[PDB]
Design a protein around this ligand. Sequence first.
Ligand SMILES: O=c1[nH]cc(Cl)c(=O)[nH]1
Ligand SMILES: [Cl-]
Length: 224
Amino acid sequence: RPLSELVERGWAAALEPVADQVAHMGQFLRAEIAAGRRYLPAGSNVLRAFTFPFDNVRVLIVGQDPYPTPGHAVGLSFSVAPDVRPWPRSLANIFDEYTADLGYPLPSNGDLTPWAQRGVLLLNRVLTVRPSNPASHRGKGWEAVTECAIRALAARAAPLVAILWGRDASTLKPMLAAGNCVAIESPHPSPLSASRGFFGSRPFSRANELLVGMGAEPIDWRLP
Ligand SMILES: O=c1[nH]cc(Cl)c(=O)[nH]1
Ligand SMILES: [Cl-]
């Protein structure tokens, strides 16, 4: 019940304003299971982005909703388990822009853990979904929780670059209007939108140049 049991302490402190809302989400999800409507990712993964330190975030990535196919979503936006192939479509697209931007080899697997360990917060606007039903928990109460997370990140003294992928960009930028923050957007990396501005957007090196402009250290994006 205390957030301190589910997330890292800095996050628990940051999210105390929505701790009741998080408790109501737990009840909603419990009811979904009782109704035979599973949800994804696994319960223990829902708040996984908030298990890496709040104080160490330098880059915030915000996507839309978790992967709807069972066996994909792991609670870090866009990430999959390291044995997963094919990669989901959005991640394949992400990884092509990665190589085009940074010149590194194509990654071996789809596990974005290393980014999360290096201060990239891999957030979705909505933290759960019903299996095979894209975006099906929109409007169910997560937006209050992720707004609190974003706003708390922005309120810290430290430099932050937010990378906003998809339709939530315009709602989120006002949350990130503060002096130590830069928010950069593009259409979502899913294939129907990616062709319209995700490809060629160079978010990884852009984010690093902006961090260096703020006197912060750039992210080591290199995946194995
Ligand atoms: O974790 C995510 N997976 C898939 C999508 Cl489309 C997204 O926006 N976020
Ligand atoms: Cl996808």
